[PDB]
Amino acid sequence: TNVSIEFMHSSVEQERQAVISKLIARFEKENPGITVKQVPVEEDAYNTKVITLSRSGSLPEVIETSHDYAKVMDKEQLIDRKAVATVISNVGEGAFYDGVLRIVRTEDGSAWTGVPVSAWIGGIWYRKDVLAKAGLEEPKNWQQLLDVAQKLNDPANKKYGIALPTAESVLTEQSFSQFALSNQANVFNAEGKITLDTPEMMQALTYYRDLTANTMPGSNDIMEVKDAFMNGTAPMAIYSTYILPAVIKEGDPKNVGFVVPTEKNSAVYGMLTSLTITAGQKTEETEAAEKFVTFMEQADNIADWVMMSPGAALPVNKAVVTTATWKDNDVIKALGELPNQLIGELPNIQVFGAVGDKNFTRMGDVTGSGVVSSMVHNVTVGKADLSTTLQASQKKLDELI
Ligand SMILES: [K+]
Ligand SMILES: [K+]
């Protein structure tokens, strides 16, 4: 009458595995009869491990996943939607901050691909002092942002108004999505068709081009953007919350502000990490996975999970901020009002492919093709004609799907 399941995750660092080992021991203590085994897998090797284990009927019952890869698993039908929805029913949809569960919806809108445990978000980081030393209030829309970037621009001195991604990489697609979605421009419409060559998408693309006249020249990827912000080449930068551990190390957290691209609405990019439960397992394995993920969502356990990356990972469960784990963390206290500001921006999470309560799985192929960041790259670095590049991009996607 004992049952054994596996928890596959990507925390291969010994510190993180120590935290997961104590969570598991706490779980097993409260649920005699259930053993959980760790399966740490480097993020690099995640997909190969998954196809290898699933083609041998040895897929672990519980799997840590980002929301985009959960879409690929759900399309391959590797996810037990009823088990996931059972967990969400237990803790309640109201346990999650608004905007969070929409992102993990299935393509038909009827269920979810996983149970969210954390998120990182992206937006505009800036240096509070430099914007005073220039006479500028923090920007609240496209116009104010462009104006602030122009005022802080100064390329003769190798200083620039904003660090903006422009490379042929997912980072550019993510940061550009924030402006496009702030203009109600999504790559998909509510019927699952590719809607790229649209008026509202052209406006965002035209605005991004104007804004990049104030960024470092050339193809800027993750290292270019981070370096420029960290060494003072630009006092504004679009980046994820993973900049926050670096500000803690190199600089002064008091001096960092955060603003959200806003035009017709506000849009922050976001990546969710979830625990999902896989399909095809014995019923007793499935119920054990259900209890395990439900356990992981209780306040003290979810808080220990999220604090494995303090500053970088945000809580998506409303209970985390009530725990002593959260309020007594040194990193969280060093950041001041920032963690509450960031959590407050979770209702504004928008991503390409998530249209209402449906997240279309063909967005993975769109992203996998690089057409959207390449399009942005061509018009910003290459100086290509914007209207015919947008039109060529629509045609490449139509031909792709
Ligand atoms: K198993
Ligand atoms: K089932």
Residue numbers in the entry: 27 to 427
Copied sentences from the primary study:
YcjN is a putative substrate binding protein expressed from a cluster of genes involved in carbohydrate import and metabolism in Escherichia coli. YcjN is a poorly characterized putative SBP in Escherichia coli, whose protein-encoding gene is located within a cluster of 12 genes. In this cluster, three genes are predicted to encode protein components of an ABC transporter, including two TMDs (YcjO and YcjP) and an NBD (YcjV). Furthermore, previous studies using radioactive palmitate labeling have shown that YcjN is a lipoprotein.
We also report the first crystal structure of non-lipidated YcjN form (ΔYcjN) to a resolution of 1.95 Å. We chose the ΔYcjN protein for these crystallization studies because it does not aggregate in solution. The crystal structure was solved with P1 symmetry, and the asymmetric unit contained two molecules. The YcjN structure is composed of two α/β domains: the N-terminal domain (NTD) and the C-terminal domain (CTD) that can be divided into two subdomains (CTD1 and CTD2) (shown in teal, gray, and light blue, respectively). The NTD possesses a three-stranded β-sheet flanked by 11 α-helices (excluding linker segments). The CTD is composed of two subdomains (CTD1, residues 145–298 and residues 359–383; CTD2, residues 384–430) and is composed of three β-strands and 13 α-helices. The NTD and CTD are connected by three segments, including β7, β4, and α15. An analysis of the binding pocket revealed that there is no discernible electron density corresponding to a bound ligand deep within the binding pocket. However, a smaller electron density was detected at the edge of the binding pocket near tyrosine 95. SBPs that bind carbohydrates can also be members of subcluster B-I. However, these proteins lack the CTD2 domain, making them structurally distinct from subcluster D-I proteins. Due to YcjN’s molecular weight and the presence of the CTD2 domain, we group YcjN into subcluster D-I.
